[PDB]
């Protein structure tokens, strides 16, 4: 099932992080016979490069940021499909030169014509690049040219709409791949198979047995590098729209009728089209901000947010979030969906907790008089598996109940994980299956859902009005009040 | 908790098994300082014995079949309270002498006027004893008098009805304790607290999802020095009436409205009133029997049933007995049950298996075009626990599904183990509540349910027509045909 | 085996309203010994998570006794049959809509 050979163009290559993100991956793919021996790569951009310079820099990159070059003869057998054609971004003449170079490479290398265009330019150049690409008519045949656009797909709703309108007027909506996200081919398929292949877990998924769900994603690393990148985005266009809006769709989705991408994506859009926040008028029951200050981590001191290089000591960019969404369809009417994220919190973990309801009437007595209800605990982070807790009997001549749980870890019956998510992403891009990518409607709907809170938090305010939590505590107390206003508690994790 | 003073005037005459089972047990219970410190035991037999005579006889028995006396003076202190009377089982003067004995010997502590009579004698002596007791007016006050009847209670519908009517005329209910089969505590209570205290298991017990149930018990020893009793017996009269028909009632019962014993027994009687043989007209569709021969259990050969010490050269006593039942109430309509039991099988398992229906449609194709439906597999002995079996995804790159499972064990995750059951039953008889003691309607109901096949099998026939199975095999072939005629399979445990 | 999911037909001479009525292969324009059907019936099935195993029967035709249009739904039978009564209780309850003269729900 190895894909057919073709040639790659890497716009804006020879820059930063492109080498370490592409060359080792493609090299490992080629070494593992993932591609036929007729694979070539081509550079781009304006700086006066050289073919020998290209070889030297690629060798340095693979040596420094990868396993190695392996056998020298292997590199000799590889080193025939790496060329260069310098040209400006907005030069139609350079584009015609590229077309002539591509034609010559097709005639000589005999790549049979099929092509995939990779784009890796800075995100403030998508419109001119796409427009000038469409000017020369490089995208006419349907299976001949696929264009991949890197993160991020705009910032606010208007920018995304303009980008969509520009893209729609050049090529048919069958070749554009928006990459994005990081959910591989393991978790998505595993969860779908677990949900849609058993005859017990399905009838207990509607609104008359389920009470509420929680979705948690936590990290422990600080802001680290990319201070300039973070200062312009904050943790609402970074982790609460790309990643955290996929677990919601997968958890609250109606059953499909097939397996190909069409039905899955249609059901996802249909679910996402009927969601809203809780209190649109008053944004105090549907959102809490935050920022991490100095604290203790791993028995060592760690500075607060306003002490890193490049961040001014007056910034108000959040690093924590908490929403309360709610669905309004014939199945999930009246069951809140508490979400979460953050940074510098301890115990890096992801989770999906579903809490059932209590029995109609109680005839037995609890040890702690609490009677903890049953819970499903789908896990996604390491030690993946499913855990469920129910009631049992305390030994002795008395009737009391105590909470115990079963367990099933994927790491015992399995554990041989697949390759890097990037490798599978590239293979799927080459062969062609849009199951793991995102359509236009999904992006626009997510932006519409998050618009009000984003606009409200974007406005300037008092510098010292940010609720603050030290590095190590789970969250500022405002989130605790948000969850305790109704009674249900945050999962202790 | 703590019972009251009482006199345990055993009516079981002179025997070996009865005394060996009782006197060591009651002595052990008294040694563990749980009963009231002062108690009395009255001896009845059919002979003349000195006080020291049967005192030292009981001392020898307890020293042989226990860990001896914990103390030295405590032995004599306990023995001060063990007396022997004189009489027979038919003489009116015998009961007159017993009445005089009791009315004179109750002076010490006055015994609060409470009495109890434990009966352990050959089955043919129940009517004379109960009639003599009723005419003599031994017990009149229904607050401090109890009578215990031992196994067997009968052999067919008519005898059971006659005995019930006879014992009803003497005294009212709430005083008879039809002890026989013992499904000890820490199992019935466990089953209740597991079923009626969760909100994810009760809604999955209907004709909507459950498709198939089956119950099995198996032994290894077969026939032993109790050949004198077993020569007139059968699988039908030994297990299917005393143990399996209580497990079935416990499995198929409706949820009760209170934790009182009366409600539970009422619900059991109600459910055991719509159970019938599947094909009453032709017994060949709802019944198979067998008898083991020419065994090889373990490392040595084992002789067959017809050739061992104590036999009938041309006998038809069965040892294997399948059955089929079909409840037809508003909740279990059109769902078949299977009961199986026998002797000389390798493992001594005793389990309950519930098989759910298949999913309405198969989006995902499994391996070999077949899938294994989900199963709940409550185990009883050994290693009581609960197991589940669902479907997950093989870590390959295709949609291939295998079957995984989750487990739970009471012993490892709760305490270590429990204590003996006979002492618990005696203590429960002492206290004055009846949770597991059967009422006098379900006995008649069980006999009515099992009468047709019993009558059909009881008619003598060709001794050469009995199906046989070698000791070590699970079952003869006819039972296999019975199960396979519909499209299911015995669970190979 | 297409013979288990469809039957064609054609109408010949008979009686409609007390007046003789010519057959189909007599009308002014049709070709004798034709094959164009007039009565059609099918048997469709739906494969999803809420209509699995519930067959649908369709019908149509011409020169039938009277004009109607119905959508008859038939419900299952009660599990327990304590009220056996008479006539074998072979009267399961149905819910029928109507999209023709005398519109209504019954």
Curated annotation (Swiss-Prot), chains A, B:
It catalyses: D-glucose 6-phosphate + NADP(+) = 6-phospho-D-glucono-1,5-lactone + NADPH + H(+). Substrate binds at residues 181, 185, 219, 238, 343, 348. It is an enzyme of class 1 (oxidoreductase). Pathway: Carbohydrate degradation; pentose phosphate pathway; D-ribulose 5-phosphate from D-glucose 6-phosphate (oxidative stage): step 1/3. PROSITE patterns: G6P_DEHYDROGENASE (PS00069). NADP(+) binds at residues 46, 151. The keyword NADP applies. Its EC number is 1.1.1.49. Gene3D superfamilies: Dihydrodipicolinate Reductase, domain 2, NAD(P)-binding Rossmann-like Domain. Keywords: Carbohydrate metabolism, Glucose metabolism, NADP, Oxidoreductase. Signal peptide: none annotated. GO terms for biological process: glucose metabolic process; pentose-phosphate shunt, oxidative branch. Belongs to the glucose-6-phosphate dehydrogenase family. Catalyzes the oxidation of glucose 6-phosphate to 6-phosphogluconolactone. This is Glucose-6-phosphate 1-dehydrogenase. It comes from Synechocystis sp. (strain ATCC 27184 / PCC 6803 / Kazusa).
